[PDB]
Amino acid sequence: STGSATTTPIDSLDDAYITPVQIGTPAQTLNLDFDTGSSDLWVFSSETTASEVXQTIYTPSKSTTAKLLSGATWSISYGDGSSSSGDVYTDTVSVGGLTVTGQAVESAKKVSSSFTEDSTIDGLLGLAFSTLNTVSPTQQKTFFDNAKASLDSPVFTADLGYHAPGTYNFGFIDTTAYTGSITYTAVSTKQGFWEWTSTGYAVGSGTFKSTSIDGIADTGTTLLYLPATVVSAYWAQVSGAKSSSSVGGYVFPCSATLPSFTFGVGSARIVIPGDYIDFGPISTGSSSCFGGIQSSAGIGINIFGDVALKAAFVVFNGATTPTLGFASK
C-alpha cells in the first residue's frame, strides 16, 4: 500500500505545515503537524479542558473502532516550551489513503497556551523513532512504524512547499518530484531522531567548508539552526544584518537580496535560496526582517528545520538500518 497527502503552510511565513489525518470510524478529519522531531500522535479531543480549546477535536466516543488503552498516559514537552498530556486510545488512522489499524491516538486532557493559540493545528503526528514516544507504561509505535508492514517500501518522503502546498508520501518515491538523484547519508538513532552529519556548508557563491555538522531533520521546526560560527559566516555576507538581543536572533533589512546557503549531503549539495532565508518582517510593515538561519547554541542541537527541508525532496528511509536522502527539486 501507499499514501499521499497534501501539506499546507498554516500562515504566510511557513511557520508550520498541516496535513489532514482521518481518525476513527466514521473518519474524523483533523489537521495535524507532521513532526519528524517527535514520536507522539496526539490530538485535541472531547477530553481536552474546554477553556484550553479554541481547533477541530477528536471524539473517541463517536468512533466505533476506538479502544481505551487501559492504564496508559502520556506527557510531552517540546523545544519551544509547549506541552500537552492525557490518556490513550488505539484507533484506525489514515493518511493520504494509507490506513493503519490499532494506532495509538493520544487524547489531550490538557494543552499548553501556544497550542490553544494556534487555531490551525489540531494536534501532532510524530515521525521520529518510536523510542521517543511518551506513552507509559509501554511506549507506542508511530504511524510510520505501524504502516511499514503494509507499505510498498518502508519509506516516507517530505516535499514541503515554499509559501505553497506540498506533499507527504508513504511507501514510494515519486521520481517526478525532484531533479538529479537522491543522495543518502547515514542516520544515528542513538537519540531517537533522524540524526545525520552534514559534510559542510557554503555561503552564497563562496567556498564550501568541510566541517561535520551533526543535526536532525525536523519538519516540526520552522528555521535552520546551525553552529554559531556557521551562522556568523552567513550573516557576515549580509550588509545590514545584526544579532538582536531583544528580538532573539539575527535581523536584517527586508529589502536585502540574501545569499543562498548550501549544505553538504555526502558529496552532494543542497542549495537553500536566499529568498527562503528571508523569513519575514518582525511585524507587518516593518523594515526589519528575522533571519531564517539562526544559532543552535540555545537549543543545544543543530536542526535542519523547514527553511532547509523545503529546499529539498527528503527521503526518510525506515529500513531496519535507516538512512536519510536528499535531492534538489
Q: How far is the CB of 156 from another protein (least distance, A)?
A: 15
- In 10-165, where do the E strands start and end? 17-23, 28-35, 41-43, 67-77, 83-95, 98-111, 123-126, 155-159
CB of 25 to another protein, least distance (A): 28
C-beta closer to another protein: residue 258 or 293: 293
Between residue 264 and residue 303, which ones bind another protein under the rule CB under 8 A? 279, 299, 303
Q: Which of 290, 310, 5, 283 is nearest to 144 (CA)?
A: 5
Distance CA 104, CA 58 (A): 13
Judged by CB under 8 A, which stretch of 73-81, 104-112, 174-182, 321-329 contacts another protein?
73-81
**Whether residue 145 lies in the annotated active site:** no
Out of 18, 95, 98, 132, which residue is the one contacting another protein (CB under 8 A)? Answer: 132
Decide: is 218 part of the binding site for another protein (CB under 8 A): yes
Region from 67-75, 214-222, 232-240, 320-328 binding another protein, contact rule CB under 8 A: 214-222
Q: Which long-range contacts (CB under 8 A, 24 or more apart) does 231-238 make?
A: 231/293, 231/294, 231/295, 231/296, 233/201, 233/203, 233/209, 234/203, 234/259, 234/261, 234/277, 234/293, 235/291, 235/293, 236/203, 237/203, 237/204, 237/206
Q: Which stretch binds another protein (CB under 8 A): 57-65, 98-106, 127-135, 153-161?
A: 127-135
Q: For another protein, which residue of 7, 31, 36, 157 counts as binding (CB under 8 A)?
A: 36
| Residue 238 binding another protein, by CB under 8 A | no
- Of the candidates 157, 147, 188, which has an alpha carbon nearest to the alpha carbon of residue 325? 157
Number of residues that bind another protein (CB under 8 A): 33
* 139-168 residues near another protein, rule: CB under 8 A: none
Distance CA 136, CA 165 (A): 36
* 41-78 b/e (C-beta count within 10 Å ≥ 16 → b): bbbbbebbeeebbebebbebeebebbeebeebebebeb
Of 39, 94, 198, 295, catalytic? 198
* Binding status of residue 13 toward another protein by CB under 8 A: yes
Among residues 222, 295, 302, 317, the one that binds another protein under rule CB under 8 A: 222
38 makes contact with another protein (CB under 8 A): yes
**Closest separation in Å from C-beta 1 to another protein:** 25
Question: Locate cell 500537552: which residue?
Answer: 84
Residues lying near another protein in the complex (CB under 8 A) are found at 11, 13, 15-16, 33-40, 76-80, 124, 126, 128, 132, 134, 192, 218-223, 279, 299, 303, 305
Which residues are catalytic, by number? 35, 198
